[PDB]
C-alpha cells in the first residue's frame, strides 16, 4: 500500500492542476474553497504542509510558465525598443491571453516588463562587445588616438555603424558610446 501514498499526491496534484490556474491566490484561500471540492478527501493521506508544499510548488510551476509566455509575447512585439515603457506597451499587448492571465496585478506585470527589458539590454551589450572583439580596426593604439582628438571614435563608429549588434543599440547612445571606451581601455 506503499504506491497508496504516491497516487494520493498525484491526485491532489490533479485538483491543483484542475482548480488553480493563477499564482495571484493564496493557499489559505484555496484550502477554504478546495475543500468544498469532493475531490478534496482523496487527499487524506497527506498531511497539511505536504499539500501546503505541492501548493507552493504549483504556484511556482505557474509562476514559470506564465513568465515564459509572457516573455515571448513580449519578444513577439516587435515595436518594443529599449525605451519603450509598460504604460506604451500594455496598449498593444492588452487582449492577449499571455498578458491578460499572467496576473490580475499591474504592478507585477509591470515589473515583469521592466525585467524583460533589463535582459534584452544585457543581452545587446554582450552582443556589443562580441562586434568589438571583431572589429581589427579597433587595437591597443585606440585609446591613444581617442584621447588625442574626435576622430577615432567616429572612425570606429563609421566601421560599426551597419552591424545588427551595433544598430540595437540605437535607443541608448550614450551606453553604446560607453561600451566602445570601455573595450579600448581593456
Ligand atoms: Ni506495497
Known amino acids: 500500500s506503499h ?12 485538483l491543483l492542476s484542475d482548480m488553480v490556474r493563477s499564482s495571484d491566490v493564496s493557499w489559505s484561500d484555496t484550502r477554504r474553497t478546495l475543500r468544498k471540492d469532493h475531490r478534496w478527501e482523496s487527499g487524506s493521506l497527506l498531511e497539511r504542509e505536504e499539500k501546503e ?4 510548488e504549483h504556484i511556482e510551476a505557474l509562476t514559470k510558465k506564465k513568465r515564459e509566455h509572457f516573455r515571448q509575447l513580449l519578444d513577439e512585439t516587435s515595436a518594443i525598443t529599449l525605451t519603450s515603457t509598460w504604460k506604451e506597451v500594455k496598449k498593444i499587448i492588452k487582449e492577449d491571453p ?39 580596426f579597433i587595437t591597443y593604439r585606440s585609446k591613444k588616438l581617442i584621447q588625442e582628438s574626435d576622430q577615432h571614435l567616429k572612425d570606429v563608429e563609421k566601421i ?14 550614450e551606453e553604446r558610446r560607453k561600451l566602445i571606451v570601455a573595450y579600448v581601455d581593456d
Not at 560599426?160 to 547612445?173: E, F, S, T
Open 160 to 173: 560599426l555603424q551597419n552591424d545588427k549588434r551595433y544598430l540595437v543599440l540605437d535607443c541608448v547612445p
Open 53 to 56: 508544499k505541492l501548493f507552493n
Open 3 to 14: 504506491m497508496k501514498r504516491e497516487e494520493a499526491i498525484q491526485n491532489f496534484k490533479a
Open 98 to 136: 499571455r498578458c491578460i492571465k499572467f496576473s490580475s496585478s499591474d504592478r507585477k506585470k509591470q515589473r515583469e516588463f521592466e525585467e524583460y527589458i533589463r535582459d534584452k539590454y544585457i543581452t545587446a551589450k554582450a552582443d556589443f562587445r562580441t562586434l568589438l572583439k571583431e572589429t581589427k
